[PDB]
Design a protein around this ligand. Structure first.
Ligand code: PLC
Ligand code: PLC
Ligand code: PLC
Ligand code: PLC
Ligand code: PLC
Ligand code: PLC
Ligand code: PLC
Ligand code: PLC
Ligand code: P1O
Ligand code: P1O
Ligand code: P1O
Ligand code: P1O
Ligand code: HXG
Ligand code: HXG
Ligand code: HXG
Ligand code: HXG
Ligand code: D10
Ligand code: D10
Ligand code: CU
Ligand code: CU
Ligand code: CU
Lengths: 382, 236, 241, 123, 51, 236, 52
């Protein structure tokens, strides 16, 4: 919900999310929904964005309508920030537990230590039930099961109310007598030295001693109870395992890419060389959360969001099967209302008119090749 | 008569209006108010922004102009009892200014913090800012200017000169409103983060300090109160 | 002017209450702006309430307004609660926002978004100032106590959140699990300025070393803001703006 | 000149230096880019230059070689991930107006000091 | 590298995406001169009126 | 007589000398002046540097010594007409100082910028700097010191004390010349770039501000002018 | 490995071995882009003749 505002070229060239899947579309309170997929870090990382040396796999949602039970980057849990390598492909997995009823647009996002949020595709997930049913039980290493929704709430309330009452008692004790104008006049006209006299000093000594003693005894009591504590666990986690993808057998060279201003279409000319030993066909072009598909080649069955999916948004001038060894040049037009709805046409406002995307080539057997393209994007007006 | 029931209205108008504003933003925060490019956002928050800016400009003009036009020309021939009444009215104005300062600089500003930690920033005109930067800040600016003008035009102590602590108390908090330019510039160019303690926010901090001139202002109002109606009782 | 002694007393009492309201809520607004934009990030999140950065920073930047308000109130009225009124106003504003917006608007739990406790430090600052009225003695000893008592004052609240938990194979405190579970879309984990360990961190000294550094810098900041408040208490008039 | 004229007229009218520092400095900061737009607008016409999109000013900087001034030295708008919509110029203008208020306030007193007429008995 | 000829012969034609060919040696020069001279004249008029 | 034709010479000498200097550097900028290790550079620019430094030292000594030796011992018995004549002469000196300040701090300093964006820096003694740091800066320093000395030794208003604005106006711009050490240090150790707005250059900025003491200096000269020959006409 | 355990004045002792830089380098420690092979000793009780 925070995208459609970021620079179109930044959205095009930061991180490409693909193979995304959502376990459920409608969940009850306390039920779990799992978000899986792969994200690829673009080689041409924009220079004003710091390299993802410190990155956090976040969830884009309107507050804790879900609680992030687990999140994985490469199979291992990542509660802290992680280091990602430019050009690598990682598979991720986020597990969410429903907490608040309603229709929530859940995004998979990545936060970078020096570049801000990289928001992936968002899917509407419906939560049904009541928030009062939500439970977050946690078992500690000391052998007690607590509910994280209300654990320590009473203690926090008690201590804050107690200290507030102490401060209010101090102020009220001094506020029983006249406060501002008589005291100002007494201080002004000659020495004051009458507005602070015993037992006011005794009361101040009592307040100071009681405050120090109460703090010390409360700390000692909170040491006896909860004798085992650990500091906050933090620190960037290195060694994120990337995916060992096979080298693509398709080489694509982009010879110019243009988009009409105004318009909802992007046109590019590609020289595709088919290596390997299978006839391939271009089936999908993904640029920035928007998937332009050729329905004659590939159909989406993973429940991708409708506003981001163009079922027939990809048109190839010659999409006949490309025999192995054969190289041909085709005109590829990616046209959908999403190009303007998500402001990919606002790249004309950007100070770097360059695009990046993913091309998916499918053979007869159905196995697919992921080839990555990037080129300058030239607007056309006349 | 002296202190009359204008104090009750001064508290109640701010309380009721800001409770309604809080209800409005709790209703339209999500659901037409998350996406800044949806048509419903334009009708529920951009229209709010336009209406509130126009109403604030009109109200400021009307209030300040009326206070300046009804200014007391013959301040010399003013009875001490009427001076006490006017001092109490100015204290009511200061109470209203304090209430507005609370609502603007604490409630809606830390509420802007809730939003600036829970959702991805989408524009310079999110609901939170519209309710804070362009509603509550102008409201307390209007109240402070009105209090200063009333003091200068009705109280002989605050006449024959511009009070420095009063001017600082009135203008420094106002400087937070043009400081919004630093906030937006410091959030889009500087600091690709949502750190609430970033140096991009010290502009509010610097000009939030100038509200400490309320101490000099209040001792000045105490002296104005204790001009003729000082005693006796006090210091005797 | 005034009719009699009794009506003068009544008028003074009414002025007292109204001016107390004015002082309290102007201080609430200004102090809350300063606090939330200088230490609010640590004050927002239990998983941000650490032993190095939170303990170091909060007293240093929070001793500002108490110093100025003390320098005004004690000097002009012999009223020894400038620090207490500053801290109480900050706490009231913070708590109102936490309950009605952090938990009201959004639904972050209170045990996750509770604020820090500062009344013990405020009480030390006020009593050490009234006793031995020396402002220098206050700036040295009371500011020391203000810096030192911060973490022990907050320990009864945050101690239960530091119970270790085995969370999916990784050691996490309860506060870490709270920060992990309750998603802050705008606040990723790396933004957390907390103690992460160094190669020059000797033994078990992070909290005390931070507390003593905070006490010393609190001495410095109190000394500066005493004169800042002295300037803000001026009663000059200008002939032309 | 437009900003200077605003600063001078807003100062003569309403002789208040505080009013000048707040309003005239605002106008000085805000009118800068619109004042220069008629000059630099023709240099922002897009050009397809050897396959890359460049404005006329970019082509000027590329063609006319500055041996001591490489391209990376150019501190210009390069885009961020927190740059929302079409707001770079107005946001910069308003930040400049606010900081212009601050700098005007400081330099008013700096000039006040520089206008002193004191004499020293010994250097 | 030796260059022979005259600097007056140098041309730097550029074709824009809006469909116009301009010479980068003198493109926008007249407009720049006009606007700067106009604003300078405005400032000079102000100062001279007061002078 | 009053204001005589010394003003024409004061303008013309600087204009002609600096036009010749500009011609010289336009002729020997390239072609014996690009390569700092070529023998021709030593004969066309190092010799220029040596000659100009010696001539500047000699001229400063001669001018300041003559002005101090011919100082007016009996300033008390000075007629108002002669005071007016001396005030006009001091104004001529100030005009010459302003012209020299222009040539040094604007023309040749931004010209140093042209060179510090067009060619790779080869030494601390490029033609541009030699013409600016070691010619124009010493020239305006000499002119400013001479103007200060003339005021102190001929004008009773500027006698019996050292004028603070005059001293600042005369010395602050001088401090730019020793500030060249920061320029060279900040260009070789700091900032491997040719950024003209780098903090290594704020030393000229800081001491370029001190030329604003010309305002206090000029109101002091106005008061000196209006001592006996103030009226009448003015203020009547 | 250490060549000698007890040495006389002016005698040489050689310390050899291998060190491996951990892949999961802690984030608060800067990467060893600039590192110095030092000797931990109470002052110059030995002089570092050579280090490789
Ligand atoms: C210092 C001078 C301050 C000046 C600025 C004042 C701003 C006022 C609010 C702007 C509203 C806007 O712009 O929006 C207009 C809204 C849009 O809602 P709607 O779609 O019509 O839904 C139905 C309306 N509900 C959702 C509010 C139920 O509708 C309206 O007409 C109603 C606006 C009522 C405002 C007056 C009540 C305030 C509380 C009572 C105590 C004073
Ligand atoms: C003391 C404060 C008083 C406020 C008075 C405001 C008057 C506005 C006049 C029209 C300007 C205009 O229309 O132009 C604004 C341009 C729009 O830029 P654009 O959309 O990128 O392109 C150009 C598109 N045109 C050609 C259609 C214009 O710049 C901006 O983005 C600035 C807009 C944000 C202003 C925030 C002010 C907040 C005030 C709060 C008061 C309580
Ligand atoms: C009543 C009079 C006698 C006592 C006086 C106090 C002496 C020290 C007591 C240490 C107790 C303890 O617990 O040690 C200190 C514990 C660590 O302990 P460790 O992990 O065992 O360290 C093992 C190593 N040792 C055996 C050498 C300790 O934390 C600290 O490093 C705290 C360091 C604080 C530094 C800043 C101090 C600034 C002082 C300013 C004064 C104006
Ligand atoms: C007028 C001034 C009043 C000051 C009152 C001080 C109360 C004493 C608190 C005990 C500290 C403690 O118990 O140890 C230090 C702990 C840190 O522990 P941790 O790292 O979180 O370990 C977690 C495990 N726990 C729960 C067992 C701790 O707290 C602090 O870092 C605050 C250190 C400040 C103490 C300085 C006192 C020295 C005397 C002052 C001299 C001029
Ligand atoms: C003007 C200066 C006067 C000095 C007065 C000192 C009184 C100490 C009171 C007991 C505190 C205590 O016992 O607690 C100190 C705690 C220990 O923390 P811990 O070991 O991590 O855990 C908690 C372990 N308990 C539960 C057993 C305590 O914090 C510290 O590490 C701070 C210790 C360093 C203090 C350095 C002071 C140097 C003074 C120099 C004077 C010339
Ligand atoms: C005459 C009285 C009514 C008008 C009052 C002004 C209201 C705002 C008008 C916006 C016009 C426009 O063009 O929008 C603003 C355009 C962007 O536009 P966009 O790309 O469509 O953004 C889409 C998202 N939205 C629909 C939410 C806009 O630039 C800006 O972000 C400018 C931001 C400036 C921030 C600093 C302001 C400091 C103010 C200081 C006051 C003392
Ligand atoms: C006394 C004060 C006088 C101020 C006069 C202002 C003239 C109006 C200029 C229109 C701006 C515009 O048209 O849009 C904004 C454009 C930026 O556009 P761009 O990003 O370069 O887009 C390129 C495409 N163009 C050519 C279509 C733009 O200019 C600016 O950034 C300057 C913004 C400052 C406007 C603030 C005015 C708000 C009212 C002030 C309230 C207190
Ligand atoms: C405040 C006190 C300032 C003191 C410093 C003054 C510096 C003077 C210049 C240094 C020259 C140098 O050093 O170079 C010596 C040059 C080297 O050129 P050349 O190879 O002989 O070629 C032939 C000479 N042309 C190339 C100049 C034609 O030749 C000379 O003899 C001529 C130097 C003439 C300087 C006097 C004329 C100035 C303009 C007229 C108005 C005053
Ligand atoms: C954040 C740091 C603090 C900011 C404020 C600094 C105040 C410094 C003092 C100052 O500005 O001097 C006041 C003059 C204008 O008043 P004057 O006309 O000098 O008043 C004459 C009577 N008097 C000699 C007894 C003072 O000053 C002027 O020349 C005009 C500017 C007035 C600025 C003060 C008001 C600021 C309100 C926010
Ligand atoms: C050389 C530095 C060593 C520390 C001394 C610094 C204190 C100086 C403060 C000062 O200037 O004097 C203010 C008051 C004056 O009150 P007196 O009327 O002198 O009271 C004397 C009786 N008394 C011992 C109970 C105080 O006297 C006091 O401030 C209180 C004196 C009692 C010391 C303990 C008070 C502080 C409690 C934390
Ligand atoms: C509470 C803050 C709201 C804004 C008011 C700040 C202005 C204060 C300036 C000030 O101290 O007064 C200086 C002059 C005094 O001139 P007067 O002799 O009062 O002229 C009154 C007739 N007039 C309305 C045409 C001006 O009066 C003026 O400065 C001009 C007053 C007219 C307002 C518009 C002038 C500014 C134009 C941009
Ligand atoms: C860039 C920031 C501004 C720099 C200038 C700061 C000026 C601060 C005031 C100052 O320095 O005081 C002057 C004294 C020397 O003069 P005095 O012998 O005090 O003059 C006696 C007569 N008087 C009391 C009416 C002044 O000071 C001394 O003790 C000797 C130093 C004189 C420095 C002023 C001249 C600087 C010329 C560039
Ligand atoms: C001194 C500041 C008081 C701020 C109280 C506040 O924000 O109230 C809104 C909140 C909203 O929560 P709730 O009461 O459950 O009503 C929800 C209605 N909306 C969502 C519109 C706020 O609770 C109330 O309305 C209580 C009334 C307090 C009167 C001083
Ligand atoms: C009064 C203390 C001010 C200290 C300023 C500060 O903390 O700045 C941190 C920042 C370091 O940037 P960093 O925290 O790494 O920002 C990370 C996020 N990005 C890269 C998007 C800015 O440094 C600067 O850029 C210069 C600040 C000048 C202050 C007048
Ligand atoms: C108020 C400062 C005037 C600066 C003018 C200047 O630098 O002139 C040098 C430049 C040199 O270009 P140009 O005239 O073509 O003669 C070239 C001769 N060189 C190459 C030696 C400069 O043009 C002139 O000599 C015109 C005379 C203006 C008299 C105020
Ligand atoms: C009044 C504002 C001063 C701000 C200083 C500044 O911009 O410094 C930039 C520089 C950052 O260096 P950078 O711009 O990256 O320089 C790149 C070129 N090299 C690496 C050769 C220096 O920081 C420093 O080295 C400290 C400056 C101390 C000022 C008192
Ligand atoms: C940094 C603290 C400086 C406070 C200024 C106080 C000036 C008082 C002059 C009367
Ligand atoms: C930062 C601006 C400070 C200007 C100094 C002015 C001092 C005036 C004293 C007479
Ligand atoms: Cu969304
Ligand atoms: Cu990719
Ligand atoms: Cu290893």
């Amino acid at each position: 919900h925070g995208e459609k505002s970021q620079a179109a070229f930044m959205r095009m060239r930061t991180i490409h999310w693909y193979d995304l899947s959502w376990s459920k579309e409608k969940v009850k309170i306390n039920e779990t929904v799992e978000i899986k997929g792969k994200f690829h870090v673009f080689e041409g990382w924009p220079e004003t964005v710091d390299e993802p040396d410190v990155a956090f796999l976040n969830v884009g949602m309107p507050g804790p309508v879900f609680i992030r039970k687990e999140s994985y980057i490469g199979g291992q849990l990542v509660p802290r920030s992680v280091r990602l390598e430019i050009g690598k492909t990682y598979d991720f997995r986020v597990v969410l537990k429903a907490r608040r009823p309603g229709d929530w647009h859940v995004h998979t996002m990545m936060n970078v230590q020096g570049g801000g949020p990289i928001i992936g595709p968002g899917k509407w997930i419906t939560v049904e039930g009541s928030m009062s049913e939500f439970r977050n039980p946690v078992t500690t290493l000391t052998g007690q099961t607590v509910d994280l929704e209300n654990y320590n709430e009473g203690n926090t309330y008690f201590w804050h109310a107690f200290w507030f009452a102490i401060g209010v008692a101090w102020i009220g004790y001094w506020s029983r007598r006249p406060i501002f104008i008589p005291r100002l006049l007494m201080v002004d006209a000659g020495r004051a030295d009458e507005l602070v006299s015993a037992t006011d000093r005794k009361v101040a000594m009592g307040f100071l001693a009681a405050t120090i003693l109460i703090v010390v005894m409360a700390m000692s009591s909170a040491n006896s109870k909860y004798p085992i504590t650990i500091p906050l666990q933090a620190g960037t986690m290195r060694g994120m395992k990337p995916l060992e993808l096979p080298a693509p057998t398709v080489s694509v060279k982009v010879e110019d890419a243009t988009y009409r201003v105004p318009g909802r279409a992007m046109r590019m000319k590609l020289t595709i060389t088919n290596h390997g030993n299978s006839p391939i066909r271009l089936g999908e072009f993904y640029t920035a959360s928007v998937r332009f598909l050729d329905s004659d080649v590939y159909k989406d069955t993973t429940g991708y969001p409708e506003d981001l999916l163009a079922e027939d948004g990809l048109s190839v001038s010659d999409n006949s099967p490309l025999a192995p060894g054969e190289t041909r040049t085709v005109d590829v037009t990616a046209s959908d209302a999403a190009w303007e709805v998500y402001r990919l046409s606002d790249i004309i406002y950007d100070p770097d008119s360059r695009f990046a995307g993913l091309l998916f080539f499918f053979d007869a057997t159905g196995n697919r090749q992921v080839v990555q393209i990037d080129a300058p994007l030239i607007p056309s007006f006349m | 008569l002296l202190d009359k029931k204008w104090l009750t209205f001064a508290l109640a108008i701010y309380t009721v209006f800001y409770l309604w504003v809080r209800w409005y933003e709790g209703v339209y925060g999500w659901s037409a108010g998350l996406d800044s490019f949806a048509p419903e956002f334009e009708t529920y928050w951009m229209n709010f922004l336009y209406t509130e800016i126009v109403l604030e400009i009109v109200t400021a003009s009307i209030l300040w102009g009326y206070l300046w036009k009804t200014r007391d020309r013959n301040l010399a021939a003013l009875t001490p009892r009427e001076e006490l009444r006017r001092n109490f009215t100015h204290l009511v104005w200061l109470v209203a200014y304090a209430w507005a300062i609370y609502w603007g600089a604490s409630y809606f500003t830390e509420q802007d913090g809730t939003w600036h930690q829970t959702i991805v920033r989408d524009t310079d005109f999110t609901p939170s800012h519209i309710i804070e930067f362009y509603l509550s800040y102008p409201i307390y600016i209007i109240t402070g200017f009105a209090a200063f003008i009333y003091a200068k035009t009705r109280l002989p102590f605050f006449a024959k000169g511009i009070s420095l602590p009063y001017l600082v108390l009135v203008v420094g908090p106002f400087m937070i409103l043009p400081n919004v330019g630093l906030n937006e510039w410091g959030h889009t160019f500087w600091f690709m983060e949502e750190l609430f303690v970033a140096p991009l926010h010290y502009g509010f901090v610097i000009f939030g300090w100038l509200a400490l001139a309320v101490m000099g202002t209040l001792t000045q109002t105490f002296y104005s109160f204790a001009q003729g109606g000082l005693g006796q009782s006090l210091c005797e | 002017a005034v009719r009699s002694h009794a009506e003068a007393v009544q008028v003074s009492r009414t002025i007292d209450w109204m001016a107390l309201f004015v002082v309290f809520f102007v201080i609430v607004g200004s102090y809350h702006i300063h606090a939330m934009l200088t230490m609010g990030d640590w004050d927002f999140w239990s998983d941000w309430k650490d032993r190095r950065l939170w303990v170091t920073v909060t007293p240093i930047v929070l001793v500002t307004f108490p110093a100025a308000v003390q320098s005004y109130l004690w000097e002009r009225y012999r009223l020894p609660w400038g620090a207490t009124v500053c801290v109480l106003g900050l706490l009231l504003g913070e708590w109102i926002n936490r309950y009605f917006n952090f938990w009201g608007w959004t639904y972050f739990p209170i045990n996750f978004v509770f604020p820090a406790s500062l009344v013990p430090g405020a009480i030390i600052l006020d009593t050490v100032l009234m006793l031995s009225g020396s402002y220098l003695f206050t700036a040295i000893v009371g500011a020391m106590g203000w810096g030192l008592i911060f973490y022990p004052g907050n320990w009864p609240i945050i101690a239960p959140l530091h119970v270790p938990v085995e969370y999916n194979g990784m050691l996490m405190s309860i506060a870490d699990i709270q920060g992990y579970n309750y998603v802050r879309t705008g606040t990723p984990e790396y933004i957390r300025m907390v103690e992460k360990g160094t190669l020059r961190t000797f033994g078990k000294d992070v909290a005390p070393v931070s507390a003593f550094f905070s006490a010393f810098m609190s001495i410095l900041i109190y000394f500066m803001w005493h004169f800042i408040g002295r300037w803000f208490s001026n009663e000059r008039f200008l002939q032309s703006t």
